[PDB]
């Protein structure tokens, strides 16, 4: 149970999706479906944080987090 925010100034997107405990950024983003709605999203060049701190792709996250993808 986390949320994901794409911080585009044109259209800010927020979704709320359920994850298995011990998930990382990669599988949460893949299962969340942000990629299919915005195909211009690159997971290795554009930057990923949680709550405003920069986070790596394979790091665990706990409940209530908010993966935020931006420039």
């Amino acid at each position: 149970r986390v949320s994901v925010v794409y911080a585009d100034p044109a259209k800010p997107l927020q979704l709320s999706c359920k994850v298995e405990d011990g998930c990382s950024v990669e599988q949460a983003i893949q299962q969340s479906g942000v990629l299919r709605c915005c195909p211009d999203i690159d997971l290795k060049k554009q930057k990923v944080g949680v709550f405003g701190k920069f986070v790596k792709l394979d790091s665990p996250l706990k409940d209530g987090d908010r993966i935020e993808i931006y420039q």
């Binding site: 997107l13 979704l15 709605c37 709550f51």
Partner: protein, 477 residues
């Protein structure tokens, strides 16, 4: 069964159904551009999947649902997407909404659909999810997604599936023609819904002013056993769910409760036909049947209309505007919305395109209420509309809620029988809008207080933890 009638209210307006239920269901030539609004349902609004310049086919899933209570939007014809932007909306306001603009190529090529095999064999959850990935939206006016309703139906015990074929509005005859021409598909869809929701019988109900529909339904459904065809009387608030439930079963739906508490589910006939098409053939909801009527239309008819077709093409197909249209509604005269212009598209919830002239419209001059108590004698829910009008006009919405504003279904039986012509339904809609605005503001304030509390708690906990960590570090130094 053995219909109790009563209803405790109801009116008999002029049906005006003889002037359009003669010609068969016509067709449309393919219009150049379609405007599909992204929110054709209740609940949350779907998010777009395709981009500008992409090539799409008939039946491609243009938008996907973000949550459970939503419905995907499918491409009605093959072509190229040109906009993901503002489109006009079928609202009395005239404001725009987020929506896709599809440029029709004209080739009309179907997508490789995922057809089923033996649909009377699988568990109900797979059939419910198949309905979910089809865009079925409940073409009855309520525009509630049929997947959520079927999933809630599977939880409880259902003893009757009710097919709401009693088309009761004046000037509208779409349901009559689809029950006349597509009776076998409606019966097959009713049997599919009876397989989904483990029940006893389907109790398909038609009003008594449709003898051809009753004869066609009886002729199509006579070898199948538990299928029943019922003839409800000719009342205006008869096609409502809570009223047809009382008319058929004899029990009343409890206030603030669903129809599944009475062990019954209500579905419109077009919705049952769409469910049959989606389960048997895999085709999504891309087209419906609408009624073009009124004295200002040259040839009133019932047309098979693709979703997102502009209103002007629908008018131009039906001969043309033979005169000056004083009002141009979208739906029946008792629940219609004043369309702003003719570039408005056709949503899944659009039922009619009435073009009413001057002599079919009553002239009204409001007067003070004389307390004749004709509103109480005609209100189907047994309420007191005059007290609601005095409390809503004095801006006492909390006082008006006690007199039955929570149970109001905006049916329009009040202003139909009012000697001093008072916009009673306008007062009720204004009061309900103000109450909804207050509720939305309170919900936003509660959410924002929870958010700032959570953020302050985590920031304090992080600062205290890092302060204790840096205090422990310097002690070891």
């Amino acid at each position: 069964y053995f219909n109790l009638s009563s209803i405790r209210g109801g009116v008999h307006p002029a049906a005006h159904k003889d002037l359009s239920a003669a010609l068969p269901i016509g067709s449309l030539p393919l219009p150049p551009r379609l405007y599909l609004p992204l929110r054709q349902h209740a609940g949350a609004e779907a998010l777009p999947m395709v981009a500008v310049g992409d090539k799409v086919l008939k039946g491609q899933l243009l938008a996907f649902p973000p949550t459970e209570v939503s419905a995907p939007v499918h491409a009605p014809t093959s072509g190229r997407i040109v906009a993901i932007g503002p489109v006009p909306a079928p609202h009395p306001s005239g404001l725009t909404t987020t929506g896709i603009v599809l440029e029709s190529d004209g080739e009309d090529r179907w997508i490789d659909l995922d057809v089923s095999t033996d649909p009377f064999a699988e568990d109900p959850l797979v059939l419910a999810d198949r309905v979910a990935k089809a865009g079925i939206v409940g073409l009855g006016g309520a525009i509630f997604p049929a997947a959520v309703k079927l999933k809630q139906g599977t939880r409880h015990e259902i003893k009757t599936v009710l097919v709401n074929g009693s088309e009761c509005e004046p000037y509208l005859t779409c349901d009559d023609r689809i029950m006349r021409e597509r009776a076998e598909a409606i019966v097959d869809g009713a049997r599919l819904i009876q397989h989904i929701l483990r029940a006893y019988s389907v109790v398909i109900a038609i009003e008594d002013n449709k003898p051809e529909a009753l004869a066609a339904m009886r002729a199509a459904a006579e070898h199948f056993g538990a299928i029943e065809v019922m003839a409800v009387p000719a009342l205006y608030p008869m096609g409502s769910a809570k009223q047809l439930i009382q008319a058929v079963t004899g029990r009343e739906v409890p206030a603030g409760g669903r129809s599944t508490d009475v062990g019954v589910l209500v579905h419109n006939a077009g919705t049952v036909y769409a469910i049959q098409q989606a389960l048997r053939f895999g085709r999504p909801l891309i087209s419906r049947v609408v009624t073009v009527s009124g004295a200002c239309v040259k040839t009133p008819q019932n047309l098979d209309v693709l979703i997102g077709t502009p209103v002007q093409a629908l008018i131009d197909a039906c001969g043309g505007l033979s005169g000056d249209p004083q009002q141009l509604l979208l739906g029946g005269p008792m629940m219609g919305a004043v369309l702003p212009s003719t570039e408005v598209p056709v949503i899944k919830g659009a039922t009619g395109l009435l073009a009413l002239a001057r002599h079919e419209l009553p002239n009204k001059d409001p007067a003070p209420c004389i307390r004749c108590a004709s509103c109480v004698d005609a209100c189907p829910m047994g309420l007191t509309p005059l007290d609601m009008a005095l409390y809503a006009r004095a801006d006492d919405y909390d006082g008006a809620s006690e007199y039955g504003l929570r149970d109001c279904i905006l049916c329009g039986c009040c202003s139909y029988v009012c000697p001093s012509h008072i916009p009673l339904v306008h007062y009720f809609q204004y009061a309900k809008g103000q109450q909804d605005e207050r509720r939305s503001a309170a919900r936003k304030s509660d959410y924002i207080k929870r958010q700032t509390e959570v953020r302050a708690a985590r920031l304090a906990e992080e600062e205290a933890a890092k302060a204790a960590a840096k205090a422990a570090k310097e002690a070891a130094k």
